[PDB]
Amino acid sequence: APRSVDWREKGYVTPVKNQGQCGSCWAFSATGALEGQMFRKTGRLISLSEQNLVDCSGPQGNEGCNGGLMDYAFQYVQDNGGLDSEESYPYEATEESCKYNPKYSVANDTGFVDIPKQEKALMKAVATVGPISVAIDAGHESFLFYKEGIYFEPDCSSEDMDHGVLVVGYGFEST
Amino acid sequence: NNKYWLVKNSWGEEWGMGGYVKMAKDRRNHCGIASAASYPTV
Amino acid sequence: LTKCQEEVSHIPAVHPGSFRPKCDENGNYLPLQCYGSIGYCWCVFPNGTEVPNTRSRGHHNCSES
Numbered sequence: 708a709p710r711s712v713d714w715r716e717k718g719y720v721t722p723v724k725n726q727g728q729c730g731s732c733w734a735f736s737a738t739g740a741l742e743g744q745m746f747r748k749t750g751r752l753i754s755l756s757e758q759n760l761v762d763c764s765g766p767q768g769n770e771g772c773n774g775g776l777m778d779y780a781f782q783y784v785q786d787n788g789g790l791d792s793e794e795s796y797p798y799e800a801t802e803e804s805c806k807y808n809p810k811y812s813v814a815n816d817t818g819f820v821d822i823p824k825q826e827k828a829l830m831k832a833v834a835t836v837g838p839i840s841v842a843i844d845a846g847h848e849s850f851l852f853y854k855e856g857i858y859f860e861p862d863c864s865s866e867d868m869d870h871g872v873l874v875v876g877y878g879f880e881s882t
Numbered sequence: 883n884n885k886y887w888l889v890k891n892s893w894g895e896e897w898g899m900g901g902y903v904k905m906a907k908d909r910r911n912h913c914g915i916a917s918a919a920s921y922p923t924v
Numbered sequence: 925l926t927k928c929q930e931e932v933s934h935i936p937a938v939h940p941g942s943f944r945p946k947c948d949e950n951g952n953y954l955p956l957q958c959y960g961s962i963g964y965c966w967c968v969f970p971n972g973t974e975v976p977n978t979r980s981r982g983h984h985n986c987s988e989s
């Protein structure tokens with residue numbers, strides 16, 4: 708509804724993280740969406756563990772550093788009954804053995820909602836829910852050396868997506 | 883152009899605008915931004 | 925189906941974190957390949973092998989044969 712939204716201003720977003728050379732972006736997108744929902748629910752912003760998801764969500768369908776899906780990650784947290792914090796379960800950028808410790812579990816999900824494939828519906832969810840997990844086509848050189856401005860790539864695909872990221876808001880430029 | 887989605891990337895703060903990127907909004911689903919969107923229920 | 929085409933055909937449309945190659949109209953690997961999840965592109969030989977010291981976040985000038 709509003710013309711502009713930026714959840715960073717309301718304390719829903721943790722600092723920018725770095726996945727390194729591991730295809731775990733699906734895990735960063737998932738902890739990103741869960742950090743915002745947990746904050747909205749408790750009023751406390753706590754960085755969640757991507758490594759906990761990389762190491763333990765194989766039964767939900769994830770493949771560690773070789774790919775995965777945000778929904779499988781949300782499914783894992785629900786099936787597992789918890790997700791450890793970043794501090795207690797640091798990111799190593801590699802798949803290791805599952806070392807989930809319930810004692811350090813600071814998050815919990817109940818399921819997930821899939822948004823209809825339309826930008827108009829996405830805007831509504833971003834304005835009312837909080838940061839939203841999304842997948843984009845980031846496999847272009849232009850995306851690599853992006854610095855400022857609005858990114859637009861004529862060769863971008865709406866059907867093939869290779870990178871999970873997090874939508875923290877939207878807006879428009881001055882007039 | 884004018885409208886954008888504020889997106890948080892995971893390649894560290896050195897990339898883009900402090901780790902963020904303004905993606906074209908309302909350009910008919912540019913880069914598939916609305917093709918696989920979801921959130922968890924808590 | 926070419927080597928490049930068979931590889932593409934094994935990865936789904938929505939694949940965050942998986943590398944999927946790009947092929948041209950003839951089924952060849954495009955000289956420049958990008959792994960969107962990690963943010964790196966590089967040049968490849970016609971057989972899909974990476975060209976040494978070509979992985980970067982900068983501009984590329986990959987060739988074919």
Ligand SMILES: *[C@@H]1O[C@H](CO)[C@@H](O)[C@H](O)[C@H]1NC(C)=O
Nearest residue numbers: 968969970971972973974975
């Ligand atoms: C690919 O082609 C290059 C150039 O001839 C060659 O050096 C390399 O060994 C080849 N790799 C394979 C797996 O055939």
